[PDB]
Amino acid sequence: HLQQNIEIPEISLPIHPMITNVAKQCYERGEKPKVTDFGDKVEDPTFLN
């Protein structure tokens, strides 16, 4: 990027590993993830934090 004089490179956005894996598996299923794809993990303020 510096040789290309981009002045700043597009830094990687840190995405959760299990989220990416679930999205990948859902794509293999031919459909985007559902509402409670994580089930009761929604009620985990630790994971939410």
């Binding site: 303020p45 630790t46 939410l48 934090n49």
Partner: protein
């Protein structure tokens, strides 16, 4: 910048807690620590010696219970840190502490030293980003969603009446009484030795407390109700033993309105309550007639509000319609109200950063008190 805060509804007897925007406090456990009476030389049994909750209630036998907090004024502040560390338990949080906003509770008519030492804990031992606690009655009002109201809490041995007009209390018309179920059970213990029974142990006394909460109500005309004969439907102990009743089922809870009979220059919740009401506006009492906020779990009695209605007729005004709000989640009302407040973008103005504590601390406590 912050995280999800946690409302810690500190009941005088049982503390409760839970994250923001929720409906039910995540944790509900009491306020006391037990330590074993007997020791062992045997190798292979338990450890710890400091337990709170099912561990303590589990093996009540050696763990000698001791309530650290008295009317908010706790004396085992270090042990409160340990208690909050227990709030950070594996079964409890597994979260961090110096990176999250929080919310505890605060009753009025207290020395500032408590708040001072509290800030010392959460901002010396901890490095909590931002935290601000206020008056509990407003949280109850948040649960109501009603501008004016007469909140009356009911702790274990703590009670206070507060009138609030659209989010504005009456500092010159707010009263407090230093008792609830605590001395009621102690007075029941008095009744026990009155008919020869001692339950001197701490756990034993809490069992007595559970018995009180399990079978007690309110009478109509105390001296006239005394004329009858209590048949005393004997309950039977977990130990399997006869449990008589006496007037205790109705007489013992009315000790609140007889402090002179217990030895205290006081008058009565409703009495001093209506007196502060008389100290209020000539017009706002009309609003408060329907705005009667009941709170605190010590209030669980048959005809509780009904006998309170009788008290209203005792302190009758000049013929004006009155109405009482008696919900079922009175203890939870404050927790949920904090959760409402915790679910607000207005805490930006309602908070105090830790940097503010670093700058002033005590001065931030005094100045930015509310």
């Amino acid at each position: 910048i912050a995280n999800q805060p946690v409302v810690i509804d500190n009941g005088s007897g049982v503390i409760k807690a839970g994250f923001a925007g929720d409906q039910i406090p995540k944790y509900c456990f009491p306020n006391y620590v037990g330590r074993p009476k007997h020791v062992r030389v045997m190798a292979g049994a338990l450890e710890g010696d400091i337990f709170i909750g099912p561990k303590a209630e589990e093996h009540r036998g050696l763990l000698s219970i001791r309530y650290p907090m008295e009317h908010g004024i706790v004396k085992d502040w270090n042990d409160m840190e340990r208690i909050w560390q227990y709030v950070y338990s594996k079964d409890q949080l597994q979260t961090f502490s110096e990176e999250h906003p929080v919310l505890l509770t605060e009753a009025p008519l207290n020395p500032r030293k408590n708040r001072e030492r509290a800030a010392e804990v959460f901002f010396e031992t901890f490095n909590v980003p931002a935290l601000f606690i206020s008056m509990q009655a407003v949280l109850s009002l948040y649960a109501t969603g009603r501008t004016t109201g007469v909140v009356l809490d009911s702790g274990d041995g703590v009670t206070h009446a507060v009138p609030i007009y659209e989010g504005f209390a009456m500092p010159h018309s707010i009263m407090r009484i230093d008792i609830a179920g605590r001395d009621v059970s102690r007075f029941l213990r008095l009744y026990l030795r009155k008919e020869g029974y001692d339950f001197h142990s701490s756990s034993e006394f809490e069992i007595v407390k559970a018995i009180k909460e399990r079978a007690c109500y309110l009478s109509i005309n105390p001296q006239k109700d005394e004329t009858l004969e209590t048949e005393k439907a004997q309950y039977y102990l977990p130990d399997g033993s006869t449990i008589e009743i006496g007037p205790s089922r109705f007489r013992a809870p009315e000790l609140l309105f007889r402090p002179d009979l217990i030895g205290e220059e006081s008058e009565g919740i409703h009495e001093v309550l209506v007196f502060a009401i008389q100290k209020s506006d000539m017009d706002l009492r009309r609003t408060l007639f329907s705005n009667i906020v009941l709170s605190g779990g010590s209030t669980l009695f048959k005809g509780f509000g009904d006998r309170l209605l009788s008290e209203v007729k005792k302190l009758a005004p000049k013929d004006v319609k009155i109405r009482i709000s008696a919900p079922q989640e009175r203890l939870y009302s404050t927790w949920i109200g904090g959760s409402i407040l915790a679910s607000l973008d207005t805490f930006k103005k309602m908070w105090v950063s830790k940097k503010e504590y670093e700058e002033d601390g005590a001065r931030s406590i005094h100045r930015k008190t509310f």
